[PDB]
């Protein structure tokens, strides 16, 4: 079971030193609070947002603060959470998690060090270790590509190295902002 942090208790006072980032997060929290009025705007919200930068700057300190200022369910866990060594079950955790989000919409889904999922798979290593990582890759691919913009499921993704990114999630509509 993904740790269901129903109440996170995190505010914008829980962050410090990120002034310029404070104003691009109020847009997301306002969309979280008002899922019905942004569809009246004719504009589409950002489906996914990638937390890129140095480690120790407060990605989850910001993401959890985002979900707290939204007062909406928060779903955080690891990127290797779906890469434990048994074939196919990693797809079930993604499926279970995203349909949990579908059932408790609007929702937040966060995956720290998510790049472990979207590791650009080099051609230097094992092969069946590749089809499981890529298996979960295509799993969340289908999951969020079949999603709707206004389901209220905001996709939070964090990793501290943007160099190992796979081009799949960089596509528009999967990470509309960074």
């Amino acid at each position: 079971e993904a740790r269901k942090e129903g109440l996170t208790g995190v505010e914008f006072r829980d962050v410090a030193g990120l002034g310029p980032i404070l104003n691009e997060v109020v847009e997301v929290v306002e969309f979280l609070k008002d899922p019905g009025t942004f569809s009246k705007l004719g504009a589409r919200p950002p489906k996914g947002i990638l937390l890129e930068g140095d480690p120790g700057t407060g990605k989850t300190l910001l993401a959890k603060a985002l979900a707290g200022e939204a007062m909406v369910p928060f779903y955080q866990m690891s990127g290797t959470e779906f890469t434990e060594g048994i074939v196919g079950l990693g797809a079930a955790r993604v499926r279970d998690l995203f349909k949990r989000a579908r059932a408790t919409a609007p929702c937040v889904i966060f995956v720290d060090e998510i790049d472990a999922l979207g590791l650009r798979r080099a051609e230097n290593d094992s092969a069946k270790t590749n089809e499981e990582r890529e298996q979960t890759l295509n799993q969340l691919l289908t999951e969020m590509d079949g999603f709707t913009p206004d389901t209220g499921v905001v996709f939070l993704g964090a990793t501290n190295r943007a160099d190992l990114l796979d081009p799949a999630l960089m596509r528009p509509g999967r990470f509309d902002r960074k």
Partner: protein, 200 residues
């Protein structure tokens, strides 16, 4: 980008299956985006030039190929620069017409300013020729962006739509962008720009 794969010999497989489905559902129109990132000129280069090249080869035998045709199917491609692609692709017989998509002109902006607010609330005191001559040089996506930004600033202001005065500010901040400057460094700026103005 769907044809970019580091395995051995699947790019040609994807080209082949795409073209076979297109031949089966003929007539058709086959649009390929990101063409500038695969169809660059073949070279020695690195080891990707062993397979990335092979991929392109498949293409060169589908649009012209043997069999003399499939139907006459129309194929189109999105590229930013024609000179980067090799001579085998862009030659006549594989790409006969080459048309260009520039930024919106005065007329293009004149009609894109209104066509982007047909589905947007807006007031009556607007002269579209003013904004058509006021933001020359932006792309159409940027016109969509400035309309989005004016609407959102209205949202943050409490009103639903925008008059001239504030979407003008939105476009001007989309041009020159939106930092603190001290009061001693500010008089230097003032003095030097005033001297340049007085001279000119």
């Amino acid at each position: 980008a769907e044809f970019i794969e580091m395995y051995m010999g699947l790019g040609a497989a994807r080209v082949r299956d795409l073209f076979n489905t297109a031949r089966s559902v003929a007539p058709c129109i086959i649009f390929i985006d990101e063409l500038d990132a695969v169809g660059r000129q073949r070279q020695g280069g690195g080891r990707s030039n062993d397979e990335r090249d092979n991929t392109v080869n498949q293409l060169l035998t589908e649009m012209d190929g043997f069999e003399a045709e499939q139907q006459g199917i129309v194929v189109m491609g999105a590229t930013n620069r024609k000179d980067v692609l090799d001579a085998a692709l862009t030659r006549p017989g594989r790409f006969d017409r080459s048309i260009e998509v520039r930024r919106p002109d005065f007329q293009g902006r004149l009609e894109a300013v209104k066509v982007h607010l047909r589905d947007k609330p807006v007031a009556a005191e607007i002269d579209y020729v003013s904004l058509a001559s006021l933001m020359g040089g932006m792309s159409g996506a940027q016109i969509a962006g400035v309309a989005n930004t004016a609407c959102f600033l209205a949202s943050r202001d409490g009103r639903s739509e925008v008059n001239q005065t504030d979407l003008t500010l939105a476009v001007e901040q989309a041009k020159y962008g939106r930092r603190f400057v001290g009061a001693g460094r500010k008089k230097r700026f003032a003095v030097m720009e005033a001297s340049i103005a007085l001279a000119a």
